[PDB]
């Protein structure tokens, strides 16, 4: 009807909303620090645009709580990462894999620290990082699922690892699942990525006797009105307060049938054309 906006421009206008084009990178890969996503370090946005051509090129992983982490970071509108001086006594830091090339040689996620044995021992790591600031801290960490029992003992000595991450409120323990998954970039192992919000007056405690993928710091969290959107439409220097994955639309009509997902001041969605 004449009251329903049914057509789109097919392009996303970068005025007045600050658009960040993910290109080959998802927000989560930019968060983790996948080497080919290094350009997104400490970037900012009103709307992050994720492309269907985005890919990962680092250690093969899963994220048990992906959607919530993605939404929390997108709503924040920033990737500001603060390095903290963790002391990891008795282990080897900065592990690298050839499935995650950083230049000519092996590498890893830039925001994560792959810890392995030193000498012939992997001690029980026990560290505490308090939040004495006035903002929320987002910690990204993970656990390594080795492919075989031999890989487990070669890396962490202990035959069964454990990652325990706590605050003053509660404690979370993850046990690795040893086993051969389908081959990805030379590896049958996997990493599971987890995350923890630490609020002012709380503390972060990490305890592990093996398989910990350690944090290097925290993301400085903020309450914002930014968002994220999956779209293949090109970014254009035009003007539009309303953005859909199909592209920008005028917001003068009361209703629109272009897309359920919208960002900015937009007409209310209806199905009727």
């Amino acid at each position, epitope marked *: 009807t004449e009251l329903v906006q049914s057509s789109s421009t097919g392009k996303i206008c970068n005025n007045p909303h600050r658009i960040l084009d993910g290109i080959d990178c998802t927000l989560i890969d930019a968060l983790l620090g996948d080497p080919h996503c290094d350009v997104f370090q400490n970037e900012t946005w009103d709307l992050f645009v994720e492309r*269907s051509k985005a890919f990962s090129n680092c250690y093969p992983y899963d994220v048990p709580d992906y959607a919530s982490l993605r939404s929390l970071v997108a709503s924040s509108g920033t990737l500001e990462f603060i390095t903290e001086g963790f002391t990891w006594t008795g282990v080897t830091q900065n592990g690298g894999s050839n499935a995650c090339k950083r230049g000519p040689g092996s590498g890893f996620f830039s925001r994560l620290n792959w810890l392995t044995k030193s000498g012939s021992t992997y001690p029980v790591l026990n560290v505490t990082m308090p939040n004495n600031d006035n903002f929320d801290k987002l910690y990204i960490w993970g656990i390594h699922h080795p492919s075989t029992d031999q890989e487990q003992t070669s890396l962490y000595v202990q035959a069964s690892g454990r990652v325990t991450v706590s605050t003053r409120r509660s404690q979370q323990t993850i046990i690795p699942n040893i086993g051969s998954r389908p081959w990805v970039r030379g590896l049958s192992s996997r990493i599971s990525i987890y995350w923890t919000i630490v609020k002012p007056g709380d503390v972060l405690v990490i305890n592990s006797n093996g398989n910990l993928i350690a944090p290097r710091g925290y993301f400085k969290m903020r309450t914002g009105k930014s968002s994220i959107m999956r779209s293949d439409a090109p970014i254009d220097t035009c003007i539009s307060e309303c953005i859909t994955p199909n592209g920008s639309i005028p917001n003068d009509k009361p209703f629109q049938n272009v897309n359920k997902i919208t960002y900015g001041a937009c007409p209310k969605y209806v199905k009727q054309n």
Partner: antibody
Amino acid sequence: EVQLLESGGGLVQPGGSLRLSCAASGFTFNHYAMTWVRQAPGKGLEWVASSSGSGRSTYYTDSVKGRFSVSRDNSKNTLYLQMNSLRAEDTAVYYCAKSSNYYGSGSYSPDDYYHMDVWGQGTTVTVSG
Amino acid sequence: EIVMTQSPDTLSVSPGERATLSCRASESISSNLAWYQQKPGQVPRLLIYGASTRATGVPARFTGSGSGTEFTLTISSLQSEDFAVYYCQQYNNRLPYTFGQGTKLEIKR
């Protein structure tokens, strides 16, 4: 609703080629591994090929290696199966199937292969002289 | 090559009676095992994953158990809709998927 719509099956001479298509809707396509399953007349289900969420990792059963090729266009939410040098033993109904998640909704496992959530309606290819 | 073997090939049981189907893996697949049901001229449908977890919408009379190399799927009381071919399947153990050869659940009379 999650839907998988298949097309491209048909009759082909031995040694011929066919391309199967699986158009997906109702879910975030690139988050899930997608795979091809075939069933010969009066026989059991057989895994053919699988593709990761990104498509950068592919796997094949031994009997189709070097002849079949799985791909996906994540901009079109479509899975493909290019079948070259077809043989009579390739006559079967071909299903595409979506991997389920493991941790529940809102999780992300594009490089793992879990119990199959949704199946296409099937497309028949017949290789004969 | 992990081999999934189902037994028996055909299981004959009266409507309303109990039925138990078995599936064995040539090596341990932990609990990465699913059961599917297929009627003639029909798409397969998921029944059990994780060896023992009923899929959404699957009636309570279906139950699975086992871990490692031996698995059982039990139907406590068969209804007309339950007579079909059942397939077990490993997933994510080095190869993405491997099916058992299937067991036909047939009406005994």
